[PDB]
């Protein structure tokens, strides 16, 4: 992004915020943090919002089947699980009984 003008950066930021408002509608902690983040004169608030998001995700990982703490890395493991489960779903068809 270093080789872009500020107008494009603001456009992306605004559209991302538009998506976030809907994504985070139900939660309250994240909603409070996002609310606090939008004053341009206090930048660290945005990174604090980011930290809140990451922690919130880490609680929901369900490590019974997954081990990565970083969610971004956890995406690949969910993808692998989908592929493997779809493969197991194939067929057996040895059906014969009383």
């Amino acid at each position: 992004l270093a080789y872009m003008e500020g107008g494009a950066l603001r456009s992306m930021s605004d559209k991302a915020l538009g998506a976030l408002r809907l994504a985070v509608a139900d939660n309250e902690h994240l909603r409070d943090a996002l609310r606090l983040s939008e004053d341009p004169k206090r930048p660290e608030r945005k990174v604090q919002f980011f930290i809140a998001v990451y922690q919130h995700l880490r609680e929901r990982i369900r490590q019974d089947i997954i081990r990565t703490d970083d969610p971004v890395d956890a995406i690949e493991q969910m993808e692998i699980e989908l592929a493997r489960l779809t493969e197991e779903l194939t067929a057996r068809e040895q059906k014969l009984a009383i």
């Binding site: 690949e76 493997r84 009383i98």
Partner: protein, 247 residues
């Protein structure tokens, strides 16, 4: 400077994707040829992991088939035998011996030999008309005559020996059966053995799960590298523009 500036963002995007990709792997890439050789090593790991996966699959299939033979109703060649048991006024022999203890089970299994899973039918002439119709049955069907409710020991020319039994089946014919372990009859503890088999098959299921997961991981890694080269080589491994612009 204008040329370098136009070129820079593409090179930077390419570098970020490359760093993510190689860091995701254990080995660090440095050139196009290097990436290709890494492709080849990835293929070799695919085709090894798949072989172990398939072999474990074969073992698991054998285990389920073995377990299934011991299931129902009195574990036998159940596919046709149950219908064949009711289509004549008879009872399955293995079912008559459902209750026998573990100590007499090997003896009886040796005694009855292949005929363990025959049917008891007290006349054997009433089947003679039905018989021509039997086109759907095990390749060797055994029939015995006696009272199904209080069946007497079939007249065998039997003779007990050390850990074995001798029998005269016919004039000029004898059979000699050695005591097996974990027999057919006594289908009370044969549930004990299928319990042992369930415990055995659990491990195969677990191991197969891990192997399949590994194969999928390798396949997706190859997909990632292919996607990369599809979208990336135009500027891969080129010299850093930040430096030259600074200069």
């Amino acid at each position: 400077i204008q040329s370098l500036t136009a070129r820079a963002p593409v090179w930077l995007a390419a570098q970020d994707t490359l760093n993510q990709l190689c860091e995701q792997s254990g080995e660090t890439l440095a050139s196009s040829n290097d990436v290709t050789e890494y492709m080849q090593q990835l293929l070799e790991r695919e085709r090894e992991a798949t072989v172990e996966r398939d072999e474990v699959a074969a073992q698991k299939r054998e285990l389920e088939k073995q377990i299934e033979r011991l299931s129902q109703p009195s574990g036998a060649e159940d596919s046709r035998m149950i219908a064949l048991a009711e289509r004549f006024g008879g009872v399955l022999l293995s079912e008559i011996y459902d209750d026998i203890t573990i100590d007499d089970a090997p003896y009886f299994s040796a005694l009855y030999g292949p005929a363990r899973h025959g049917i008891v039918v007290p006349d054997l002439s009433l089947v003679r008309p039905h018989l021509e119709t039997l086109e759907d049955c095990p390749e060797d069907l055994y029939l015995i005559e006696g009272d199904p409710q209080s069946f007497d020991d079939s007249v065998f020319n039997a003779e007990e020996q050390t850990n074995a039994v001798l029998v005269k089946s016919s004039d000029r014919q004898w059979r000699y059966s050695r005591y097996p372990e974990l027999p057919l009859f006594g289908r009370a503890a044969r549930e004990n053995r299928l319990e042992a088999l369930n415990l055995e098959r659990d491990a195969l299921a677990e191991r197969y799960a891990t192997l399949s997961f590994d194969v999928q991981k390798i396949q997706r890694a190859h997909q990632a590298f292919s996607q990369f080269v599809g979208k990336h080589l135009s500027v891969a491994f080129d010299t850093d523009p930040e430096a030259e612009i600074r200069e």
